[PDB]
From a paper:
RcsB belongs to the FixJ/NarL family of response regulators with two domains connected by a long linker. The N-terminal REC (receiver) domain of RcsB is composed of a five-stranded central β-sheet surrounded by five α-helices and contains the conserved aspartyl residue (D56) that serves as the phosphoryl acceptor. The C-terminal DNA-binding domain (helix-turn-helix [HTH]) of RcsB has a four-helix bundle fold with a classical helix-turn-helix DNA recognition motif.
In both crystal forms, the RcsB dimers displayed similar structures, and the DNA had a classical B form with an average base pair rise and twist of 3.2 Å and 34°, respectively; the DNA was slightly bent along the surfaces of the RcsB HTH domains. The RcsB dimer observed in two different crystal forms is asymmetric. Instead, an approximate two-fold axis was present between each of the RcsB domains of a dimer. However, these two axes met each other at an angle of about 120°. In the RcsB-DNA complex, the helices that form the HTH DNA recognition motif of the DNA-binding domain (α8 and α9) bound to the floor of the DNA major groove perpendicular to the DNA helical axis. K180 and S184, located on helix α9, made hydrogen bonds (H-bonds) with G-8, A−9 and A−6 in one-half-site (TTAGGAA) or with G−30, A−31, and A−28 in its complement (TCTAAGA) on the other half-site of the DNA. The side chain amino group of K192 in the RcsB-DNA22 complex contributes to electrostatic interactions, but it is too far away for a direct H-bond.
Numbering used by the authors:
A (entry chain A): 2 to 141, 148 to 209
B (entry chain B): 2 to 125, 131 to 141, 149 to 207
The structure:
DNA sequence: GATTTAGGAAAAATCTTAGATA
DNA sequence: TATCTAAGATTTTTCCTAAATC
């Protein structure tokens, strides 16, 4: 019935915001606020807590951030239910976080009543998906072929398409075709978006 | 004597946060919260308001965002004092924003008290703008074009948004890269995240 | 039976340059 | 002096479409 929450976000003004917005829900209890991964993981065993609410990227270098951070948490506190609350509009990175079996994603964009919804579905033992989230996942075997991986690696290294083409003794259109379809598979629409995925799981 | 604030940020959870933290200060009045540039500029004349508190980037395509958006505001409501509350430790982009002559910056990182400080200095030359200044500088368009790019927008798309030619925007991006001593798009973005 | 490879067509982004601004 | 703008020819990349490969 009653609920124990830990909030982790590196923007203190946001942390304040989540605390104040969660303060409203009388079956929720804020039990720790944390600003880095390290303070978080150190105090995790100390608070019996049901729910962790985190952003992806934050400071904290021994335990990391993003996927890594969580994966560590699911591994070591499997009892603990994580909601990711992110600014991240990237379909692929969100998609990777959903392959982790977490209990929620909630974008920081247009989601005033989303969090309470996300948390309320956690009592029910159900998942919530913001309309905003599923919209972001509309683009989406999504696993990529060996050439596709190569072409992508080289690209994520700084190499240009025409340069990749020279290196692998293949046509520019071949390499572009390869990159382009990798991006299709990954549900990612532009180079900025691709590179950001490419450093998320890396 | 009393103070009227308009808050504009696209994260509603954050908007809530700022409203609740400002709610504490009895000589401050939240008079409008806004989530895009267009709703903001449309309601600007409707609220006699002293202070706009904004992030850089938000939706709103008639009037844009960031520098452009600000500059539009200082042009049309020069009475209005803007505090920018932003979420990036990019030195270059911030550099351009501090050359803008607004009446406050506050980073979203580590600044629970900074916002009422910023507002309180406005009662009584800029302290807040002084505060992290120490920490090859790029031109206002150059910063914008770069920001927008690093936001995921394509050169062609940037061009559409700003009602300017693709060659203008490319020329701007390219020279920003030159200023920054960076060779290619991969290299630029990687800088842009430090 | 999907991946690997490209052709021409096409569009997107850069290398010029150059007037204008301020 | 540095910055804002964009036409002009050029380069890079993608769109569309289709062949051999494995």
């Amino acid at each position: 019935n009653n609920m124990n929450v830990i909030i982790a976000d590196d923007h203190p003004i946001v942390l304040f915001g989540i605390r104040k917005s969660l303060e409203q829900i009388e079956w929720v209890n804020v039990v720790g606020e944390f600003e880095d991964s390290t303070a978080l993981i150190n105090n995790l065993p100390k608070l019996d807590a049901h729910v962790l609410i985190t952003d992806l990227s934050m400071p904290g270098d021994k335990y990391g951030d993003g996927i890594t951070l969580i994966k560590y948490i699911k591994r070591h506190f499997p009892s603990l239910s994580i909601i990711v609350l992110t600014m991240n509009n990237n379909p692929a990175i969100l998609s990777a976080v959903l392959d982790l079996d977490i209990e929620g994603i909630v974008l920081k964009q247009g989601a005033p009543t989303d969090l309470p919804k996300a948390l309320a579905a956690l009592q029910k033992g159900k998942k919530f998906t913001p309309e905003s989230v599923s919209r972001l996942l509309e683009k989406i075997d999504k696993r990529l072929s060996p050439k596709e991986s190569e072409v992508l690696r080289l690209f994520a290294e700084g190499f240009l398409v025409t340069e990749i083409a020279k290196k692998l003794n293949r046509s520019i259109k071949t390499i572009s075709s390869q990159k382009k379809s990798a991006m299709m598979k990954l549900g990612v629409e532009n180079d900025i978006a691709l590179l950001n995925y490419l450093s998320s799981v890396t």
